[PDB]
Amino acid sequence: GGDISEPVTQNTLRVVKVFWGLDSSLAQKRHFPSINWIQSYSLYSTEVGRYMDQILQQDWSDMVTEGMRILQEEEQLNEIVRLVGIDSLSDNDRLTLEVAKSIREDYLQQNAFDDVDTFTSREKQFNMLKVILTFGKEARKALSLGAYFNEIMEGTVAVRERISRSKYIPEEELAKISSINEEIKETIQLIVS
Amino acid sequence: GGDISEPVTQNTLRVVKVFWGLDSSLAQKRHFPSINWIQSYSLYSTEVGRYMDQILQQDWSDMVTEGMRILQEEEQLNEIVRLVGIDSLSDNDRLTLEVAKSIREDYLQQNAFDDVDTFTSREKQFNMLKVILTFGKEARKALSLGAYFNEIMEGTVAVRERISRSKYIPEEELAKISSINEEIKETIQLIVS
Amino acid sequence: NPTRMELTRLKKQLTTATRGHKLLKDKQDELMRQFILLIRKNNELRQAIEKETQTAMKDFVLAKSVEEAFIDELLALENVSISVVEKNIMSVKVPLMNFQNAELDRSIDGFTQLLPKLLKLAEVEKTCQLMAEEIEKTRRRVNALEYMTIPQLEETIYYIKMKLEENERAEVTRLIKVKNM
Amino acid sequence: TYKIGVVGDKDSVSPFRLFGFDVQHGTTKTEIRKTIDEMAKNEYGVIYITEQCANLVPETIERYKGQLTPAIILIPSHQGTLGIGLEEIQNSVEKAVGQNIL
Amino acid sequence: DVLPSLSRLKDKGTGAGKTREDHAATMNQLFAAYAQGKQAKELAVVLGESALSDIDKIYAKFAERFENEYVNQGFYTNRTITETLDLGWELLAMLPRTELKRIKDDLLDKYLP
Amino acid sequence: DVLPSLSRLKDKGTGAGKTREDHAATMNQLFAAYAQGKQAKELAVVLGESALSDIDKIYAKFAERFENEYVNQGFYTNRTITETLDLGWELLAMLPRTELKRIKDDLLDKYLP
Amino acid sequence: DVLPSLSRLKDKGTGAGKTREDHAATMNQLFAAYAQGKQAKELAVVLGESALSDIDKIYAKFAERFENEYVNQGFYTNRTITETLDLGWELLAMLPRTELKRIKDDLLDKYLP
């Protein structure tokens, strides 16, 4: 029944440091791989974070932490939407949901049977997550500068569609992913004006 | 697990006559002694009540019955509040909760490590319970006289603090508890007018 | 956790929660119907007073284009305020409100005629705002029960019920073993 | 006893001063938000405001919506409305009833 | 607690000649009003005193008096069946005649105070 | 109910030479449109019809015909795979061509009625 | 989680000449405030921040600062008992003095900011 409280799963989790909890509701929603990102964990995350920061010479661990914070906040916000409706959330909270949405379907969701999406290199993963996080960062600043959530979404249709296609960008054309960052900065600053 | 349906407790309750059921939830919020007043019972209550009525020359039996009845009413009210909220509660029900709160915090809770609170004589017990019930009775009348719950509570902050600290009044100074009854009646009448 | 005392208690909470859900849903519906009557009155009032106010304003601006010196003097020197009495519409606290040159002269009687309807608009529009908030507060309590509280009770009751039966079978299994010993 | 305030352009809301209303003439999101807040702090019963000024402070007005007083009432200017007042009515119908009842 | 309590042979020891002719009807009526009154009390807690009608506030008061004066008689009080039936009618007298549906107007006109 | 239903090996029995070349694309699209249609339907239930956009209303109507005409065929009616696929294109035509994002242009140009 | 946690030997190891005289009083008041604040938070997250009384809204904020600044200190942070007790007082200062019923007036006058 998918109930992890049973002896085999419990005794295993006593001695392993990584838990990838698969989810039936995700599988029905065509969210693959069906890993529950709220329940899953890796006790190697902190050590891997240090390794990645060193090998990439980037603030990768901070990016991973921020990405998970957004997903965790999304779970909290989704409970509110269930009760009051999405139209009750502030612009700041509306943005968090969209960024979480981008993480879910532009990054977490991955097609095993697609020639490009089947494997994502370490370098490609960094560029994809960086771009997703940059949009949220730039949009967050736009809100504090007087721009409204509705205006930001309407004027960033093209760039958000490009972010959502970055998973299919060939490994030898990763410059096409990194250049999305500038396009994000440009369009949003134009929306503020 | 605190499960009183286990053989030791169950077989014991068939032969003993008093049940002081300790409660984990009371213990966690540091309500001591953590005796569950809804689960607990004494088969000696009626006889002891007769004895006390004779000793005190007061209607002690009625006061204890009324005290327990308020606690039972609070319990029933809490069943709703938990699954509905304090939104639609009338002034009378809000008064009931306040009186029950006073019974719990000002009477039931008792610090074994305080030099004065560690022991309470029968007479001091009578005076403390009298005061608590008196506030309920006087507040109840004021509500029927057109006064609002919010007004009654705001105008009786000082006297209710005297009630809350009755437990610390020395046995040689019981007149400082009994006099509260007159402050309750005077203060509440002033609120009515 | 999964004892028979917990089971009976959670079954009781479910019955209560189910009834509370039905009562709250009925309340929201009753508030909605009363709101429908009020919101239509709000709409008609606003549409009318918007046309009248703008007209009175456009008649005053045509009078301005004398001098700004004289108009400033006339608009200097009765003080009107409002009393706010509270009343209940079902469960909602709701306000009841009552008041306490030639071409530039006729326009004054234009604004003076607006006032009763302007105050009525304030009273009705606020009333609808307060009714709408109560509907939404009732709706949240309905959704809490329907999508959280009740399902959590249903699933826990089902679970405890299953766990109780499992333990009973494990107990008889042991007894049969002990028997043969 | 509560006071009455008015917020809008001089040419439109000037004659309200004849009845002793606090008539203010803000034009920017900052100054209009300040006036409404102080008016609320001074326990005003009703605040009338032109839609051109109300268009600048939607978050300030929304804060007092569920409050008894002050009642923030959108009115037109001599130019007209932006349709905000009737839109707010229309919107509340959609989320309370579920369909256009007006 | 009369609601889950049951006697399956009760219809065999009641009525004219055994107790009195108004026995069965008043029993059904008292049971109905008691359950209805408990529902009314719950309604007041859930939705407030605003939701209570005038009939509802009576049923709530009925259930209160029913527990406190009818059921709560004392462990040393010996009530004759006549006294019990009469007390039932005094409690049913709180309700309008319109609410007394399970009682035929024949016996309602004879016993209702 | 096609939403929780699944066939894991379906790829090995569909497509040109087995059924028809438009099998997989329409399946992906019909499933996706029906899930969005059901989602819009549930939104109309909880928040009202005015909570739906003009597109959401189209998808909701799609899910109705999908259930009433496609899934519903009767217990004594046999549909050839050709009839099933053609009927799928009829329902997909309700949606704007711009919304058929799971189907490439070559298949849309050839089959879309 | 301090609520289900316990120490059975804390009474004779604390107080004047051992830690500080305000140790036991502040411990009890913090426990009581946290249990009530935790309850209020859980209610507000489901029924809304406007569903709490004016005082419970204060307790909800207390329980949050309590978890984030008091309990959460870091696995390499070593606080002296004085630092711990003083921090406890800063959190109790969030509550109205009338709510601090577990602490006597002599301690409040001396330590409460």
PDB file of N, CA and C in Angstrom, chain A residues 13-79:
ATOM      1  N   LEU A  13      16.009   1.914   6.399  1.00  0.00           N
ATOM      2  CA  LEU A  13      16.272   3.329   6.654  1.00  0.00           C
ATOM      3  C   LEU A  13      17.095   3.534   7.920  1.00  0.00           C
ATOM      4  N   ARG A  14      17.190   2.487   8.730  1.00  0.00           N
ATOM      5  CA  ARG A  14      18.017   2.529   9.926  1.00  0.00           C
ATOM      6  C   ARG A  14      19.504   2.527   9.571  1.00  0.00           C
ATOM      7  N   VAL A  15      19.849   1.964   8.413  1.00  0.00           N
ATOM      8  CA  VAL A  15      21.258   1.804   8.046  1.00  0.00           C
ATOM      9  C   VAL A  15      21.692   2.470   6.731  1.00  0.00           C
ATOM     10  N   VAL A  16      20.751   3.014   5.963  1.00  0.00           N
ATOM     11  CA  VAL A  16      21.119   3.753   4.752  1.00  0.00           C
ATOM     12  C   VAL A  16      20.920   5.259   4.921  1.00  0.00           C
ATOM     13  N   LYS A  17      21.695   6.043   4.178  1.00  0.00           N
ATOM     14  CA  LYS A  17      21.671   7.494   4.337  1.00  0.00           C
ATOM     15  C   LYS A  17      20.841   8.209   3.272  1.00  0.00           C
ATOM     16  N   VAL A  18      20.369   7.459   2.282  1.00  0.00           N
ATOM     17  CA  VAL A  18      19.592   8.038   1.190  1.00  0.00           C
ATOM     18  C   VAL A  18      18.237   7.355   1.037  1.00  0.00           C
ATOM     19  N   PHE A  19      17.188   8.168   0.966  1.00  0.00           N
ATOM     20  CA  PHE A  19      15.818   7.690   0.834  1.00  0.00           C
ATOM     21  C   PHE A  19      15.136   8.393  -0.338  1.00  0.00           C
ATOM     22  N   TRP A  20      14.905   7.651  -1.417  1.00  0.00           N
ATOM     23  CA  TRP A  20      14.150   8.160  -2.558  1.00  0.00           C
ATOM     24  C   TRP A  20      12.729   7.601  -2.504  1.00  0.00           C
ATOM     25  N   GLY A  21      11.824   8.334  -1.870  1.00  0.00           N
ATOM     26  CA  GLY A  21      10.451   7.885  -1.738  1.00  0.00           C
ATOM     27  C   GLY A  21       9.636   8.133  -2.993  1.00  0.00           C
ATOM     28  N   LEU A  22       9.245   7.055  -3.670  1.00  0.00           N
ATOM     29  CA  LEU A  22       8.427   7.168  -4.873  1.00  0.00           C
ATOM     30  C   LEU A  22       6.970   7.425  -4.513  1.00  0.00           C
ATOM     31  N   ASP A  23       6.271   8.147  -5.385  1.00  0.00           N
ATOM     32  CA  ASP A  23       4.940   8.645  -5.072  1.00  0.00           C
ATOM     33  C   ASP A  23       3.946   8.288  -6.171  1.00  0.00           C
ATOM     34  N   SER A  24       2.814   7.717  -5.773  1.00  0.00           N
ATOM     35  CA  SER A  24       1.814   7.258  -6.729  1.00  0.00           C
ATOM     36  C   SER A  24       1.036   8.414  -7.347  1.00  0.00           C
ATOM     37  N   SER A  25       0.812   9.461  -6.560  1.00  0.00           N
ATOM     38  CA  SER A  25       0.064  10.621  -7.036  1.00  0.00           C
ATOM     39  C   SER A  25       0.866  11.398  -8.076  1.00  0.00           C
ATOM     40  N   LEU A  26       2.186  11.429  -7.908  1.00  0.00           N
ATOM     41  CA  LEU A  26       3.072  12.025  -8.900  1.00  0.00           C
ATOM     42  C   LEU A  26       3.054  11.206 -10.186  1.00  0.00           C
ATOM     43  N   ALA A  27       3.093   9.882 -10.040  1.00  0.00           N
ATOM     44  CA  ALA A  27       3.084   8.981 -11.192  1.00  0.00           C
ATOM     45  C   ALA A  27       1.805   9.128 -12.009  1.00  0.00           C
ATOM     46  N   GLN A  28       0.684   9.332 -11.326  1.00  0.00           N
ATOM     47  CA  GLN A  28      -0.584   9.561 -12.014  1.00  0.00           C
ATOM     48  C   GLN A  28      -0.577  10.908 -12.740  1.00  0.00           C
ATOM     49  N   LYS A  29       0.105  11.889 -12.153  1.00  0.00           N
ATOM     50  CA  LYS A  29       0.190  13.231 -12.725  1.00  0.00           C
ATOM     51  C   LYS A  29       1.251  13.331 -13.818  1.00  0.00           C
ATOM     52  N   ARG A  30       1.824  12.193 -14.198  1.00  0.00           N
ATOM     53  CA  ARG A  30       2.893  12.148 -15.196  1.00  0.00           C
ATOM     54  C   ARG A  30       4.134  12.944 -14.771  1.00  0.00           C
ATOM     55  N   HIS A  31       4.382  12.986 -13.466  1.00  0.00           N
ATOM     56  CA  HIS A  31       5.584  13.611 -12.925  1.00  0.00           C
ATOM     57  C   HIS A  31       6.654  12.538 -12.728  1.00  0.00           C
ATOM     58  N   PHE A  32       7.612  12.467 -13.652  1.00  0.00           N
ATOM     59  CA  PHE A  32       8.662  11.447 -13.597  1.00  0.00           C
ATOM     60  C   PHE A  32      10.073  12.040 -13.606  1.00  0.00           C
ATOM     61  N   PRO A  33      11.000  11.453 -12.823  1.00  0.00           N
ATOM     62  CA  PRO A  33      10.781  10.360 -11.862  1.00  0.00           C
ATOM     63  C   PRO A  33       9.857  10.761 -10.711  1.00  0.00           C
ATOM     64  N   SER A  34       9.133   9.790 -10.167  1.00  0.00           N
ATOM     65  CA  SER A  34       8.074  10.073  -9.204  1.00  0.00           C
ATOM     66  C   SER A  34       8.585  10.212  -7.778  1.00  0.00           C
ATOM     67  N   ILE A  35       9.726  10.869  -7.627  1.00  0.00           N
ATOM     68  CA  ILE A  35      10.317  11.062  -6.311  1.00  0.00           C
ATOM     69  C   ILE A  35       9.657  12.216  -5.556  1.00  0.00           C
ATOM     70  N   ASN A  36       9.109  11.896  -4.386  1.00  0.00           N
ATOM     71  CA  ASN A  36       8.534  12.883  -3.483  1.00  0.00           C
ATOM     72  C   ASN A  36       9.646  13.743  -2.883  1.00  0.00           C
ATOM     73  N   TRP A  37       9.709  15.002  -3.305  1.00  0.00           N
ATOM     74  CA  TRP A  37      10.805  15.890  -2.941  1.00  0.00           C
ATOM     75  C   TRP A  37      10.651  16.472  -1.532  1.00  0.00           C
ATOM     76  N   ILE A  38       9.491  16.251  -0.924  1.00  0.00           N
ATOM     77  CA  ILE A  38       9.253  16.704   0.440  1.00  0.00           C
ATOM     78  C   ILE A  38       9.640  15.614   1.443  1.00  0.00           C
ATOM     79  N   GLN A  39       9.313  14.366   1.118  1.00  0.00           N
ATOM     80  CA  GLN A  39       9.591  13.239   2.010  1.00  0.00           C
ATOM     81  C   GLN A  39      11.000  12.666   1.846  1.00  0.00           C
ATOM     82  N   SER A  40      11.541  12.739   0.635  1.00  0.00           N
ATOM     83  CA  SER A  40      12.865  12.184   0.374  1.00  0.00           C
ATOM     84  C   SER A  40      13.966  12.955   1.096  1.00  0.00           C
ATOM     85  N   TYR A  41      15.108  12.303   1.285  1.00  0.00           N
ATOM     86  CA  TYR A  41      16.271  12.953   1.864  1.00  0.00           C
ATOM     87  C   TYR A  41      17.557  12.241   1.473  1.00  0.00           C
ATOM     88  N   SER A  42      18.666  12.960   1.594  1.00  0.00           N
ATOM     89  CA  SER A  42      19.992  12.371   1.489  1.00  0.00           C
ATOM     90  C   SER A  42      20.876  12.953   2.578  1.00  0.00           C
ATOM     91  N   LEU A  43      21.376  12.097   3.460  1.00  0.00           N
ATOM     92  CA  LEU A  43      22.288  12.544   4.505  1.00  0.00           C
ATOM     93  C   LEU A  43      23.712  12.759   3.969  1.00  0.00           C
ATOM     94  N   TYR A  44      23.875  12.662   2.654  1.00  0.00           N
ATOM     95  CA  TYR A  44      25.139  13.016   2.010  1.00  0.00           C
ATOM     96  C   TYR A  44      25.103  14.432   1.434  1.00  0.00           C
ATOM     97  N   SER A  45      23.942  15.082   1.496  1.00  0.00           N
ATOM     98  CA  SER A  45      23.741  16.397   0.870  1.00  0.00           C
ATOM     99  C   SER A  45      24.749  17.468   1.290  1.00  0.00           C
ATOM    100  N   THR A  46      25.054  17.525   2.580  1.00  0.00           N
ATOM    101  CA  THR A  46      25.958  18.548   3.089  1.00  0.00           C
ATOM    102  C   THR A  46      27.390  18.313   2.620  1.00  0.00           C
ATOM    103  N   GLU A  47      27.834  17.063   2.675  1.00  0.00           N
ATOM    104  CA  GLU A  47      29.176  16.722   2.223  1.00  0.00           C
ATOM    105  C   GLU A  47      29.301  16.872   0.711  1.00  0.00           C
ATOM    106  N   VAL A  48      28.271  16.450  -0.014  1.00  0.00           N
ATOM    107  CA  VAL A  48      28.252  16.600  -1.464  1.00  0.00           C
ATOM    108  C   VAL A  48      28.251  18.083  -1.836  1.00  0.00           C
ATOM    109  N   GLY A  49      27.478  18.876  -1.095  1.00  0.00           N
ATOM    110  CA  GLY A  49      27.462  20.318  -1.275  1.00  0.00           C
ATOM    111  C   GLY A  49      28.849  20.941  -1.242  1.00  0.00           C
ATOM    112  N   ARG A  50      29.660  20.538  -0.267  1.00  0.00           N
ATOM    113  CA  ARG A  50      31.040  21.014  -0.170  1.00  0.00           C
ATOM    114  C   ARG A  50      31.877  20.582  -1.377  1.00  0.00           C
ATOM    115  N   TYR A  51      31.734  19.318  -1.763  1.00  0.00           N
ATOM    116  CA  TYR A  51      32.440  18.771  -2.916  1.00  0.00           C
ATOM    117  C   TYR A  51      32.081  19.530  -4.190  1.00  0.00           C
ATOM    118  N   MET A  52      30.791  19.797  -4.367  1.00  0.00           N
ATOM    119  CA  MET A  52      30.296  20.471  -5.559  1.00  0.00           C
ATOM    120  C   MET A  52      30.755  21.923  -5.616  1.00  0.00           C
ATOM    121  N   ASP A  53      30.694  22.615  -4.484  1.00  0.00           N
ATOM    122  CA  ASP A  53      31.162  23.997  -4.422  1.00  0.00           C
ATOM    123  C   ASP A  53      32.632  24.083  -4.818  1.00  0.00           C
ATOM    124  N   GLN A  54      33.400  23.079  -4.410  1.00  0.00           N
ATOM    125  CA  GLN A  54      34.829  23.056  -4.675  1.00  0.00           C
ATOM    126  C   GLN A  54      35.119  22.742  -6.141  1.00  0.00           C
ATOM    127  N   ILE A  55      34.440  21.737  -6.683  1.00  0.00           N
ATOM    128  CA  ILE A  55      34.714  21.299  -8.049  1.00  0.00           C
ATOM    129  C   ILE A  55      34.130  22.243  -9.106  1.00  0.00           C
ATOM    130  N   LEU A  56      33.027  22.909  -8.771  1.00  0.00           N
ATOM    131  CA  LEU A  56      32.393  23.844  -9.695  1.00  0.00           C
ATOM    132  C   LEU A  56      32.931  25.255  -9.520  1.00  0.00           C
ATOM    133  N   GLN A  57      33.506  25.520  -8.350  1.00  0.00           N
ATOM    134  CA  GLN A  57      33.899  26.874  -7.961  1.00  0.00           C
ATOM    135  C   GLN A  57      32.712  27.828  -8.067  1.00  0.00           C
ATOM    136  N   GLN A  58      31.555  27.339  -7.630  1.00  0.00           N
ATOM    137  CA  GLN A  58      30.320  28.110  -7.600  1.00  0.00           C
ATOM    138  C   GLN A  58      29.626  27.896  -6.259  1.00  0.00           C
ATOM    139  N   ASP A  59      28.643  28.735  -5.957  1.00  0.00           N
ATOM    140  CA  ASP A  59      27.868  28.581  -4.733  1.00  0.00           C
ATOM    141  C   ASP A  59      26.719  27.610  -4.972  1.00  0.00           C
ATOM    142  N   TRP A  60      27.063  26.367  -5.287  1.00  0.00           N
ATOM    143  CA  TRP A  60      26.078  25.353  -5.641  1.00  0.00           C
ATOM    144  C   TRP A  60      25.214  24.926  -4.457  1.00  0.00           C
ATOM    145  N   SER A  61      25.838  24.740  -3.298  1.00  0.00           N
ATOM    146  CA  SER A  61      25.109  24.313  -2.108  1.00  0.00           C
ATOM    147  C   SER A  61      24.044  25.325  -1.676  1.00  0.00           C
ATOM    148  N   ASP A  62      24.330  26.611  -1.863  1.00  0.00           N
ATOM    149  CA  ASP A  62      23.362  27.660  -1.559  1.00  0.00           C
ATOM    150  C   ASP A  62      22.186  27.615  -2.526  1.00  0.00           C
ATOM    151  N   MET A  63      22.472  27.283  -3.780  1.00  0.00           N
ATOM    152  CA  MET A  63      21.441  27.197  -4.806  1.00  0.00           C
ATOM    153  C   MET A  63      20.510  26.022  -4.541  1.00  0.00           C
ATOM    154  N   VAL A  64      21.092  24.893  -4.153  1.00  0.00           N
ATOM    155  CA  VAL A  64      20.314  23.698  -3.831  1.00  0.00           C
ATOM    156  C   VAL A  64      19.438  23.950  -2.605  1.00  0.00           C
ATOM    157  N   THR A  65      20.012  24.614  -1.606  1.00  0.00           N
ATOM    158  CA  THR A  65      19.288  24.966  -0.390  1.00  0.00           C
ATOM    159  C   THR A  65      18.119  25.904  -0.699  1.00  0.00           C
ATOM    160  N   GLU A  66      18.369  26.910  -1.529  1.00  0.00           N
ATOM    161  CA  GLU A  66      17.321  27.850  -1.914  1.00  0.00           C
ATOM    162  C   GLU A  66      16.201  27.175  -2.711  1.00  0.00           C
ATOM    163  N   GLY A  67      16.576  26.276  -3.617  1.00  0.00           N
ATOM    164  CA  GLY A  67      15.609  25.544  -4.416  1.00  0.00           C
ATOM    165  C   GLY A  67      14.679  24.687  -3.576  1.00  0.00           C
ATOM    166  N   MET A  68      15.224  24.071  -2.532  1.00  0.00           N
ATOM    167  CA  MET A  68      14.432  23.243  -1.627  1.00  0.00           C
ATOM    168  C   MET A  68      13.576  24.092  -0.688  1.00  0.00           C
ATOM    169  N   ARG A  69      14.066  25.276  -0.334  1.00  0.00           N
ATOM    170  CA  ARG A  69      13.308  26.184   0.520  1.00  0.00           C
ATOM    171  C   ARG A  69      12.027  26.605  -0.191  1.00  0.00           C
ATOM    172  N   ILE A  70      12.164  26.895  -1.481  1.00  0.00           N
ATOM    173  CA  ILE A  70      11.052  27.287  -2.337  1.00  0.00           C
ATOM    174  C   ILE A  70      10.005  26.182  -2.474  1.00  0.00           C
ATOM    175  N   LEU A  71      10.466  24.946  -2.640  1.00  0.00           N
ATOM    176  CA  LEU A  71       9.568  23.802  -2.742  1.00  0.00           C
ATOM    177  C   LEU A  71       8.842  23.557  -1.419  1.00  0.00           C
ATOM    178  N   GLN A  72       9.557  23.736  -0.312  1.00  0.00           N
ATOM    179  CA  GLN A  72       8.962  23.568   1.009  1.00  0.00           C
ATOM    180  C   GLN A  72       7.939  24.661   1.296  1.00  0.00           C
ATOM    181  N   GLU A  73       8.235  25.878   0.853  1.00  0.00           N
ATOM    182  CA  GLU A  73       7.298  26.982   1.007  1.00  0.00           C
ATOM    183  C   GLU A  73       6.079  26.772   0.113  1.00  0.00           C
ATOM    184  N   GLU A  74       6.296  26.164  -1.053  1.00  0.00           N
ATOM    185  CA  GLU A  74       5.198  25.845  -1.962  1.00  0.00           C
ATOM    186  C   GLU A  74       4.200  24.896  -1.311  1.00  0.00           C
ATOM    187  N   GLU A  75       4.707  23.903  -0.583  1.00  0.00           N
ATOM    188  CA  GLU A  75       3.835  22.955   0.109  1.00  0.00           C
ATOM    189  C   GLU A  75       2.969  23.656   1.151  1.00  0.00           C
ATOM    190  N   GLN A  76       3.541  24.653   1.819  1.00  0.00           N
ATOM    191  CA  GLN A  76       2.806  25.439   2.801  1.00  0.00           C
ATOM    192  C   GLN A  76       1.760  26.310   2.114  1.00  0.00           C
ATOM    193  N   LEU A  77       2.147  26.930   1.002  1.00  0.00           N
ATOM    194  CA  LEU A  77       1.248  27.807   0.258  1.00  0.00           C
ATOM    195  C   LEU A  77       0.101  27.036  -0.385  1.00  0.00           C
ATOM    196  N   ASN A  78       0.382  25.820  -0.840  1.00  0.00           N
ATOM    197  CA  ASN A  78      -0.645  24.983  -1.453  1.00  0.00           C
ATOM    198  C   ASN A  78      -1.761  24.590  -0.486  1.00  0.00           C
ATOM    199  N   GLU A  79      -1.427  24.479   0.796  1.00  0.00           N
ATOM    200  CA  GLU A  79      -2.426  24.196   1.819  1.00  0.00           C
ATOM    201  C   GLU A  79      -3.369  25.384   1.975  1.00  0.00           C
TER     202      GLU A  79
END
